[PDB]
């Protein structure tokens, strides 16, 4: 990596290394009652909090916070789902504690057709043996995607994402010189990740029908 690239990675890692489930939440995962409604509530709190952590992490991505203070909204709005599912893949592969979180996820009003692809994606991520740098850079890349629905200035976003893609590529060559297609593999996983925008929207539909309540922030980002 060049020094500018090491600098970029060092700051992304400093911030990404601050992400961790709050203890009060962890405690609830262990002791709260077990029911569809309760499980949804626990998940809704973890999600609301994670959107807040994403906001902060994004605010630190270089150049981001100098973009049209609205094309910014397009990005966070557009990437929240993908970032959360990537984060969850990371945690289910690290581990149990998460053993319990899974049992709650499996009885939270999520239809079996979406449970299936969620756990298969986790297994597929587990397979790539990703490093923290890879999870951090991929999340940054997910957030800085130039294809979001409301992107006016797609070219500017493109400019800020490029350097990250470049850093990831070099990292893959450095830490897996004997697995040259690793990088391509990570990019393919980003593709499977995008299908969660649809899975998640179907989950929102089932939950709404089933009369669940979200959170002011989540209602905003997902238009409920």
């Amino acid at each position: 990596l060049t020094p500018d690239q090491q600098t970029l990675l060092h700051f992304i890692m400093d911030s990404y290394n601050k992400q961790r489930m709050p203890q009060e939440i962890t405690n609830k995962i262990l002791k709260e009652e077990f029911s569809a409604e309760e499980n949804f509530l626990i998940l809704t709190e973890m999600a609301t909090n994670h959107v807040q952590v994403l906001v902060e992490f994004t605010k630190k991505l270089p150049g981001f916070q100098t973009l049209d203070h609205e094309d910014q909204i397009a990005l966070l709005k557009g990437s929240a789902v993908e970032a959360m599912f990537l984060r969850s893949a990371e945690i289910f592969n690290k581990k149990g504690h998460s053993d319990l979180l899974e049992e709650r996820i499996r009885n939270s009003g999520i239809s079996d057709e979406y449970i299936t692809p969620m756990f298969s994606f986790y297994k597929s991520i587990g397979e790539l043996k990703m490093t923290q740098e890879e999870y951090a850079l991929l999340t940054a890349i997910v957030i800085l995607s130039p294809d979001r629905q409301y992107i006016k200035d797609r070219e500017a976003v493109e400019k800020l994402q490029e350097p990250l893609l470049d850093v990831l590529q070099k990292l893959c060559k450095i830490h897996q010189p004997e697995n040259p297609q690793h990088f391509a593999c990570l990019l393919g996983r980003l593709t499977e990740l995008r299908t969660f925008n649809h899975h998640h929207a179907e989950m929102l539909m089932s939950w709404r029908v089933n009369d669940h309540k979200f959170t002011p922030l989540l209602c905003e980002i997902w238009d409920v």
């Binding site: 906001v55 605010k59 910014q72 909204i73």
Partner: peptide, 11 residues
């Protein structure tokens, strides 16, 4: 937006 809160915490 409209997405007041998101605009908010995005200081």
């Amino acid at each position: 937006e409209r997405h007041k809160i998101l605009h908010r915490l995005l200081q």
